A paper describes a structure:
To determine the structural basis of improved inverse agonism, we solved crystal structures of PPARγ LBD bound to NCoR1 corepressor peptide and compounds 2 (SR33544), 3 (SR33068), 4 (SR32904), 5 (SR36706), and 11 (SR33486) with resolutions ranging from 1.42 to 2.22 Å. Overall, the repressive PPARγ LBD conformation in these structures is highly similar to crystal structures of PPARγ LBD bound to NCoR1 corepressor peptide and T007090724, GW9662, and ZINC5672437 (0.15 Å Cα rmsd). Helix 12 adopts a solvent-occluded conformation within the orthosteric ligand-binding pocket, which exposes a larger AF-2 surface that enables the binding of the NCoR1 CoRNR motif. All of the crystallized compounds contain a pyridyl nitrogen, which in T0070907 is at the fourth position, with additional R1 groups that interact with the aromatic triad residues (His323, His449, Tyr473) via pi-stacking interactions. Compound 2 contains a pyridyl nitrogen at the third position pointing towards the NCoR1 corepressor peptide bound at the AF-2 surface, and a cyano group at the fifth position that points towards helix 11 with no water-bridged interaction with the side chain of His323. Compared to T0070907, the substituted pyridyl R1 groups in compounds 2, 3, 5, and 11 afford more favorable ΔGbind values. This suggests that the improved compound functional efficacy may originate in part from additional aromatic ring polarity and polar compound modifications projecting towards helix 11 or the bound corepressor peptide.
Numbering used by the authors:
A (entry chain D): 2260 to 2272
B (entry chain A): 202 to 259, 276 to 477
Amino acid sequence: NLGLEDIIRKALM
Amino acid sequence: GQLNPESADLRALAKHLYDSYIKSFPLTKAKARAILTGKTTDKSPFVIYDMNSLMMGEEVAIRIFQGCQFRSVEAVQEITEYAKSIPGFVNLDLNDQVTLLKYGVHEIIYTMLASLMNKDGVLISEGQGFMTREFLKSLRKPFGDFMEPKFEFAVKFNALELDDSDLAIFIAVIILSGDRPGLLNVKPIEDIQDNLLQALELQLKLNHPESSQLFAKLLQKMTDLRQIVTEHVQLLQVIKKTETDMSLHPLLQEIYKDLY
Ligand SMILES: *c1ccc([N+](=O)[O-])cc1C(=O)Nc1cncc(C#N)c1
């Protein structure tokens, strides 16, 4: 689920 | 047990997590229970219990899943914000922060969905509707099987009578799981989780005198959360294999997009 990883990575920024 | 510097630090951690949980999650268990028990003057959800009331309240399965996943972005962001408040979390390797959250978010979303559920049904449309359990169960396959395992879990989990201060620590324990596949540095994760588990054990002793072995019972609920997450894969396999009609009333598709 690369979409989910991208959401999390952005939210961690 | 004694009130010593360690125990005071564990109470301070519990308070820090509770305060951050309140800041991160606008929809709390207290707010959901006030609606579900009629202990509010302000919010009265419309009850959807059959096809007739569904109308008075005015690829399919994959569209539902795409929609509920999109609607769950805000929850993923709230859980990520909460994770940043857990002491030590942002100092972990960033790959590991992402790994912990990508597995933990689904378990946390189901934990919080239980707050919206009782044995009769589930709150929807931001607390403005209540969709009954047996109406969901009555819908044609494969839809009628989607939510019943979550209700079975929620009844057992809600029987533990946890409050938001308990849930704040439990959710932190879920996030700091050293068992997730692909973690690079397990020891610093387990170091944080050990502190969180100590805080959770003390919280549950202080807050639940009448419960026997609540800490163990709550940790065992993680098995049921994991089962539900793991079963989502099988649900996708059932859908592709279903040869019967999978049409569904548009208002039911919208209701399911609010679930998970
Ligand atoms: C969204 C809406 C409704 C349902 N359902 O009724 O079963 C399920 C979803 C959904 O997509 N659930 C989901 C998505 N990604 C991961 C997991 C897990 N674990 C669940």
